[PDB]
Ligand binder design. Structure first.
Ligand SMILES: Nc1nc(N)c2c(n1)CC[C@@H](CNc1ccc(C(=O)N[C@@H](CCC(=O)O)C(=O)O)cc1)N2Cc1cn([C@H]2C[C@H](O)[C@@H](COP(=O)(O)O)O2)c(=O)[nH]c1=O
Ligand SMILES: Nc1nc(N)c2c(n1)CC[C@@H](CNc1ccc(C(=O)N[C@@H](CCC(=O)O)C(=O)O)cc1)N2
Ligand SMILES: O=c1[nH]c(=O)n([C@H]2C[C@H](O)[C@@H](COP(=O)(O)O)O2)cc1CO
Ligand code: NA
Ligand code: NA
Ligand code: NA
Lengths: 264, 264
């Protein structure tokens, strides 16, 4: 995507060399923002093939409030493998915080249900937020959330969303993270009878790993292609009733996939 | 400031009409980002007179963990009067969440001490974060947090900070928000023996109130003046031990103040 390839070139040209948690090393910038008008097309990177199978199941898993990777296994999804405990648990990561944020007094807040009701009853609200950054449970989480915080917004019948990503592996993570939240905006918009607006991506520590450089130079040599179109084939009874089969990406004609080793 | 006046003009050129909680009406955009290199000067708006005294005291109050306006009144600061209850209490807003975020298992997390220790011991960490968005306590707060989430970053011996402001009153609120976080970066950098880097401001619902329009255009007719310079005159033994008199602002030569009504 044009904005994505501009970010990748900016990190190369302007990033500072950092040592990181993994010992791999990165080039890093701090603070970036991109905007995708979702009526221009679904923002799925075209300069390498990105597989949505795993994205979609993961988002459906988040929405079910699930943090045990069994559901992912049942669908041959392995991306949470490293971090699950001997019983297949990750602790209270995204799904738990989205669906059952615990109050200090033993109650719970369903942030997804709250946002749905805010969009349907108070669409002008400036407080339509889902946060995974539960400070009091970070220690129990298998991994600290990268997509920390997102906010919805309604203007002129269009639903927009902004994601704050505290830490962004530009090569391996960001294509999938953009697609996940773009998919969620379409789902939310459908359940609230809204049109789709913008997906705004904001990054904190935005980096390229030092062993992703050959892959980065290859990708930057490729020209982007027109964006595909997301079709939702069925309107479920609620945001919690979608199925993998409900989604079709029409007209996705990407360049070949690019493999690179993940920093553990 | 150049960046601030460009934001005002963008809301005016690109914003849409929204009703709002307060009944006033706004012109708003969703998603914005701007940067202030703090080595260029202290980013206190010059195209109207802004009163740094309230900004400083409010920040010292936050850092104490206080959420009652009595301290502010001891120092003739009235900016929180409209939302306090009969006893001066705001509920568990910024200061409480910064210093003592309550967990479900009875603990409290001092996020300011946490990020100070991360900056001293693990400055490459990608999760040097303070959040005020405590979902489980929003209903106890007089106002939901506007400057909701911020992240620190270190490169080339300089401390940077990014704020996610989910809701921004551009004319009345934003000048105070920018200066407050810039001051905090200087204080943190002092305590960590770092130089100052960038303050990155990111906005969610970024709006001009309908009854701020004549004031906004008056300000836009003015040329920014040179940024003032912040001098800190002591190194306290901790981030919690600063005093109002430790700060001096040099070379602040603003255009006249512009009065506007706050939306309650
Ligand atoms: N959907 C999603 N994506 C994730 N990437 C992701 C998860 N779920 C959940 C967990 C973990 C999964 N880890 C993996 C990601 C990718 C592969 C992998 O090899 N994929 C292939 C094949 C895929 C396919 O076939 O379709 C391929 O893609 O080709 C393996 C494991 N993550 C977190 C995550 C991390 N990071 C960065 C920021 C920092 O570099 C560092 C954090 O470290 P720190 O705490 O110090 O900041 O990980 C992001 O940027 N975004 C993120 O979501
Ligand atoms: N809608 C809304 N709600 C909030 N709670 C909120 C904000 N906006 C924005 C920032 C913060 C509240 N801080 C302030 C900041 C400034 C003033 C103020 O009075 N400024 C004028 C004087 C006006 C006059 O004399 O008529 C000046 O600068 O001279 C009041 C409160 N929080
Ligand atoms: O620091 C601030 N900066 C700021 O701009 N505001 C403004 C944003 C909104 O106009 C208003 C909050 O109202 P609301 O929760 O509906 O967004 O106060 C409020 C605060 C309070 O800290
Ligand atoms: Na940038
Ligand atoms: Na504590
Ligand atoms: Na003190």
């Amino acid at each position: 995507m044009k904005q994505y390839l501009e970010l990748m070139q900016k990190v190369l040209d302007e990033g500072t060399q950092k040592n990181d948690r993994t010992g791999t090393g990165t080039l890093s910038i701090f603070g970036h923002q991109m905007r995708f008008n979702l009526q221009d097309g679904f923002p799925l990177v075209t300069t390498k093939r990105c597989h949505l199978r795993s994205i979609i199941h993961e988002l459906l898993w988040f929405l079910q409030g699930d943090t045990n990777i069994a559901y992912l296994h049942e669908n041959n999804v392995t991306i949470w493998d490293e971090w699950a405990d001997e019983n297949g648990d990750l602790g209270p990561v995204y799904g738990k915080q989205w669906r059952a944020w615990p109050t200090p007094d033993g109650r719970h807040i369903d942030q997804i249900t709250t946002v749905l009701n805010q969009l349907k009853n108070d669409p002008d609200s400036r407080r339509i937020i889902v946060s995974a950054w539960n400070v009091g449970e970070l220690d129990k989480m298998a991994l600290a959330p990268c997509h920390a915080f997102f906010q919805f917004y309604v203007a002129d019948g269009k639903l927009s969303c902004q994601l704050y990503q505290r830490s962004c592996d530009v090569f391996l993570g960001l294509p999938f993270n953009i697609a996940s939240y773009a998919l969620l905006v379409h789902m939310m918009a459908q359940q609230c009878d809204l049109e789709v607006g913008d997906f705004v991506w904001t990054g904190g520590d935005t980096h390229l790993y030092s062993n992703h450089m050959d892959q980065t130079h290859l990708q930057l040599s490729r020209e982007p292609r027109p964006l595909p179109k997301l079709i939702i084939k069925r309107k479920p009874e609620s945001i919690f009733d979608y199925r993998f089969e409900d989604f079709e990406i029409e007209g996705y004609d990407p360049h070949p996939g690019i493999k690179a080793p993940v920093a553990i």
